[PDB]
């Protein structure tokens, strides 16, 4: 298991060693708090700020990770997904 922490946001990713990843997201803040809905069917984690969708995080098997933002309305994905390089570019996605 891996556990990243940014401010009051805790992101936990763990493989159940039989080949099954499942990401969990938790935030302690009481305002502008993040929450995540995990869709194991596509290994996509959707982050919402105060119940409003903001970014999609796809943790594929290839090992890599991608991130894409929703429009201002918070209903659909915009532009094109990007690949996360380092944990310095990954800690931003949790702000």
């Amino acid at each position, epitope marked *: 298991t891996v556990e990243i922490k940014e401010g009051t946001v805790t992101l936990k990713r763990e493989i159940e060693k039989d080949g099954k990843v499942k990401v969990f997201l938790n935030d302690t803040a*009481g*305002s*502008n*708090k993040k929450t995540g809905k995990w869709e194991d069917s596509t290994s996509t984690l959707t982050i*919402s700020a*105060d*119940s*409003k*969708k903001t970014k999609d995080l796809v943790f594929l098997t290839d090992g890599t990770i991608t991130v894409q933002q929703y*429009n*201002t*309305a*918070g*209903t*659909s994905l915009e532009g094109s997904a990007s690949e996360i390089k380092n944990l310095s570019e990954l800690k931003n996605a949790l702000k």
Partner: antibody
Amino acid sequence: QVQLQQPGSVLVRPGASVKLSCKASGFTFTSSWMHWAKQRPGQGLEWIGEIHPNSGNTHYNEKFKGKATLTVDTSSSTAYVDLSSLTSEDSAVYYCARMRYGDYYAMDNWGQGTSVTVSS
Amino acid sequence: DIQMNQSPSSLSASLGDTITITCHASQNINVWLNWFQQKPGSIPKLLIYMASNLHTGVPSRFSGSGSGTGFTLTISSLQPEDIATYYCQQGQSFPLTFGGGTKLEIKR
């Protein structure tokens, strides 16, 4: 229970400016998304914008950008709209409402509205 | 910038009747559509969200369907308290836009 208080009506001269208030109670204000809309007699509803109280971040309807500015005050749980250099086209009812996301994505609570008159 | 059109623009119906109100959008919005009711000199009231879900407190004789570019509100067994103007609103993308509205009258 969620309540949104707005003054009933206000009179203001042409070219002048006005400040509209909307006091919220019944839910966590800093944790919300407040919206404003206007409705002129028998003309329908026009969307003005949205503000996330916890930061002051806003999203405007381009046709109001220079006319209206949204702001808040976390300490008194109040949302505001400032209208500048009013004209006759500004006379109308202005509503504040709470937008709830999640599985809803709809404005389920509205204020009584403030009837505004632009006359000399 | 989505344009919403409603039809009919107004209608007369008898008590007990079942009426239909349709709303069409400029572009695909998939299911991001709401229905509001406004009685004369009163405030807007949420009826249906995400094109087919009833909002608490609303009589089950109200229902909606559709997706894409067409959505219809159905009102069965028309009651005297249904005398209102109804509006559809898309929340697909900013700015949010409302349809012109459909005014309802009871025929006698």
